[PDB]
Design a protein around this ligand. Sequence first.
Ligand SMILES: Nc1ncnc2c1ncn2[C@@H]1O[C@H](COP(=O)(O)OP(=O)(O)CP(=O)(O)O)[C@@H](O)[C@H]1O
Ligand SMILES: Nc1ncnc2c1ncn2[C@@H]1O[C@H](COP(=O)(O)OP(=O)(O)CP(=O)(O)O)[C@@H](O)[C@H]1O
Ligand SMILES: C[C@H](N)[C@@H](CCCCCC(=O)O)NC(=O)O
Ligand SMILES: C[C@H](N)[C@@H](CCCCCC(=O)O)NC(=O)O
Lengths: 224, 224
Amino acid sequence: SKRYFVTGTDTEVGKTVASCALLQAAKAAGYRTAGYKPVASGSEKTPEGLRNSDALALQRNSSLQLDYATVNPYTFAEPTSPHIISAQEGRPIESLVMSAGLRALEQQADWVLVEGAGGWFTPLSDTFTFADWVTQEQLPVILVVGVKLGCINHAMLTAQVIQHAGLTLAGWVANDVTPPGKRHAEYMTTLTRMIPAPLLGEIPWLAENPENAATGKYINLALL
Amino acid sequence: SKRYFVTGTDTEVGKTVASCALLQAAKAAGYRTAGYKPVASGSEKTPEGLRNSDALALQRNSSLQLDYATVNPYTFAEPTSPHIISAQEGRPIESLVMSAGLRALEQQADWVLVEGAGGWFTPLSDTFTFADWVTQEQLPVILVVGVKLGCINHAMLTAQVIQHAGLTLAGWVANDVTPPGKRHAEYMTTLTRMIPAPLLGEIPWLAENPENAATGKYINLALL
Ligand SMILES: Nc1ncnc2c1ncn2[C@@H]1O[C@H](COP(=O)(O)OP(=O)(O)CP(=O)(O)O)[C@@H](O)[C@H]1O
Ligand SMILES: Nc1ncnc2c1ncn2[C@@H]1O[C@H](COP(=O)(O)OP(=O)(O)CP(=O)(O)O)[C@@H](O)[C@H]1O
Ligand SMILES: C[C@H](N)[C@@H](CCCCCC(=O)O)NC(=O)O
Ligand SMILES: C[C@H](N)[C@@H](CCCCCC(=O)O)NC(=O)O
């Protein structure tokens, strides 16, 4: 299987909207797809247990019918850093459970997208970060950049740390989190020059429910 | 002279409020102080020319009476990345002018704080970033962390890139940009464990005009 890890320049830059666009393009290409969000914090109560909205988006944009626990093994109610609520609840986030989950998806899907939580360095325990697990798995990384003032600094910090860890930055996606503003073209030119990876596409500002929008068309999967 | 460069985990995390606190503590220690903001974008019109508010804060928190142009040689009206408006206006930001300005302050002050613009990697031209000038000058760096969800990732990205450039991370300052929230103690413990530099102090959430507040007391200059 082809496998990709999706990270963002910050929490809340639209990493899930860009992951749904990527899944929609891979399905259109004829791949058997599966989204995977191993760890999620910030979840709602239902009859079946806690459900996270981002993991639900990944589950319904996958071409295979998947059970929720397969998409998201670790679900926490509180919207904070996963290491804080893991310790609080007495539920360790185990690297072997996160890896087994990835393998289980690979039995049925040939194109798997793995979405982390928050940014690159999100702690999972007091001695282990999400970055350590991605390095261990040797996943190529796609960076989602929310285009706003301050995103050049955050895109270059994340890009350099991934290359320092000896991983492949497979590409980047520009996500328009605000309406058209005055220096949009110049920001897109600087970002294209500075990130050492192909620009895979640009998702426009979509006011109403953008993870349910048909966004596959904004991604050029040929460059991956 | 003692010289320090102050950077932030993002634009608008309170780097100027923390720089005014640092200047107030150094004055209380008996140093002859000068703040320096070489490049500023986002300025108001006055009879004397354009004036940036952050540079004005640095100028009035300095113990020496300094002229505005000495504090801030490069002033741009538009609140965008300095390389965009520099090119637009036909006014190159010269590394030799930025360095001469630092030396001119060193003739009269024995404790100089240098504040950049935005985050670490802010571009000054198409081939030159603020990070290149700080490396060239070999300035020790103080990191200001606005405490909010996502700041662990941004504090660790910036910390690692500065150490990769062979510079000293002299310390960090926690700035409380929001009112007391639920996981504040756990965020302060994680940040203290993860940033490889002393915590110099914590500035509380100050609703009304915090750069005019007397904040020197929250900084322990002994650890610098
Ligand atoms: N193209 C777009 N147009 C309009 N709104 C967008 C958008 N992309 C993202 N958003 C909005 O920004 C917010 C964050 O988006 P999203 O849920 O995809 O982020 P994310 O995956 O980075 C969150 P986390 O850090 O918790 O993993 C959402 O409310 C979403 O609707
Ligand atoms: N301790 C605090 N309490 C309340 N508000 C604070 C605060 N620290 C910073 N702020 C507010 O956050 C905003 C940004 O602060 P500040 O001007 O110091 O940031 P900064 O220097 O990072 C800006 P730039 O990126 O343009 O250099 C201001 O409106 C300021 O009043
Ligand atoms: C306009 C901002 N407020 C700030 C400069 C921000 C540059 C951000 C560049 C980037 O996107 O990383 N200006 C200043 O510090 O004077
Ligand atoms: C609660 C957030 N929305 C997100 C996790 C953010 C962790 C941020 C850690 C940090 O401060 O760097 N959750 C999630 O992606 O499910």
